[PDB]
Every structure is written in C-alpha cells, then in structure tokens.
Amino acid sequence: EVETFAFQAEIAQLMSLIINTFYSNKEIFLRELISNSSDALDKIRYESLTDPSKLDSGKELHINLIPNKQDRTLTIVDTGIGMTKADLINNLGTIAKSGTKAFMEALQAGADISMIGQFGVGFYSAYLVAEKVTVITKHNDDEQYAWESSAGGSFTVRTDTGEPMGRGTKVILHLKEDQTEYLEERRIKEIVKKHSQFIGYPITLFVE
Numbered sequence: 001e002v003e004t005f006a007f008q009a010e011i012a013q014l015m016s017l018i019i020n021t022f023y024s025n026k027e028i029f030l031r032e033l034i035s036n037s038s039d040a041l042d043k044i045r046y047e048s049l050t051d052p053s054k055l056d057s058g059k060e061l062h063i064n065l066i067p068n069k070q071d072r073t074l075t076i077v078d079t080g081i082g083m084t085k086a087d088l089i090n091n092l093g094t095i096a097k098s099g100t101k102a103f104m105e106a107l108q109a110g111a112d113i114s115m116i117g118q119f120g121v122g123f124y125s126a127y128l129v130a131e132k133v134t135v136i137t138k139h140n141d142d143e144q145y146a147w148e149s150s151a152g153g154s155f156t157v158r159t160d161t162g163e164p165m166g167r168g169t170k171v172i173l174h175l176k177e178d179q180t181e182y183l184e185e186r187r188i189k190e191i192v193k194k195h196s197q198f199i200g201y202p203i204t205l206f207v208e
C-alpha cells in the first residue's frame with residue numbers, strides 16, 4: 001500500500017536548509033505553490049491544445065486555496081496536469097536535484113530563500129510553513145496518488161483511495177503550530193495579492 005522513499009541527498013539537504021535556516025519571509029511558500037500549480041495548469045492546457053480529451057477529467061483550469069483551521073491545513077488545489085507516480089517520486093515532476101545545486105550555488109552567490117522558485121524546487125518552500133505536506137495528484141491515464149512528507153529524509157507514496165479529484169494536484173499543507181496565519185483569509189488574500197496577482201488561472205480563496 002504505502003511505499004517509503006528516501007529523498008535524494010540534495011533534496012534532503014534543501015529541505016533541512018528550508019526547515020532549519022532562519023528566514024522570516026515564509027509567505028513565499030504560497031507563491032511558489034501557486035506558481036507550481038500554474039505551471040501544471042499550463043501544462044495541461046498546452047496538452048489540451050492538440051488533445052482536448054485531456055480535459056475530459058475537468059475543463060476548469062483553476063487553483064483553489066482551501067484553509068481549514070480545524071485540520072490546520074492550507075490546501076492548494078489545482079486542476080493542472082497532475083503527476084504520475086513516476087513524477088511524484090521524481091521530485092514531484094521537477095529537476096529538483098540540479099535545481100537544488102543551482103539554488104545552493106545561488107545562495108552562496110548572495111541569493112535568499114525567496115528565490116527558490118527560479119531553481120525549480122519552490123515546492124519545498126512548503127516546508128517553511130508545513131510540518132507535513134501531503135500531495136494528492138491525479139494525472140490522466142494514471143491513478144490518484146498521495147505523496148507525503150514530514151521531511152526528515154523520506155517521503156511516501158501510496159495509491160490514494162480518498163476523494164477522486166479528476167485531475168490535478170492538491171497540496172495539503174499541515175501547517176506548523178506557529179504558522180496558522182496562513183489560514184487567515186486576509187493573510188492568504190494579502191499574499192496572493194502580493195505575490196500571485198497575475199497568475200493566469202482563477203485562484204479561489206475558499207472561506208471557512
């Protein structure tokens with residue numbers, strides 16, 4: 001049922017760096033996750049230009065931000081391309097190893113953590129706020145999977161039997177105790193307006 005994988009060493013490093021570096025500007029996590037979502041939506045969109053049936057799994061290309069104060073989760077759902085199991089395991093569809101190298105090298109050359117998205121590993125910025133991240137994902141012609149990590153060197157992948165989502169990715173941020181501001185409507189609004197105001201898909205901030 002549940003497979004446990006080791007993060008590649010460089011991703012493990014990246015993540016402990018994100019977890020362990022003092023860095024107050026934690027809100028960038030959301031930009032980075034919306035941006036990922038945006039990229040996956042682009043991707044399904046691009047694909048659907050030559051195969052519109054790729055959108056049978058849901059035509060609406062959107063990003064939903066779903067704070068849940070009870071579960072202490074902020075969930076970002078996109079109806080993007082989704083990820084195959086292979087993508088999930090392979091750093092959620094990124095070139096995370098090399099990107100981490102470039103990111104480490106950028107940090108050495110003056111960069112700050114907010115630039116994480118330039119190096120294609122801004123997903124891991126989730127770990128600025130989330131003690132655990134769960135990624136539910138559904139790519140066409142592949143099953144729904146849940147990926148999960150609380151960092152510490154390993155993630156899990158399992159075939160997800162919960163809510164079918166049609167297509168896309170849902171990133172569930174199990175927020176750190178002290179990062180509950182990211183569940184506040186106005187805060188989320190503020191960050192989305194600050195950092196994601198031009199994202200080309202509708203972003204719906206769900207209310208509680």
Ligand SMILES: O=C(c1ccc(O)cc1O)N1CC[C@@H](C(F)(F)F)n2nccc21
Pocket residue numbers: 032033035036037038039040041043078080081082083087092093094123137168169171
């Ligand atoms: O499914 C995702 C996805 C991943 C993380 C996230 O936070 C939200 C997402 O929708 N993908 C799809 C695979 C990959 C690709 F599209 F570039 F190939 N990619 N790149 C950024 C986002 C994603």
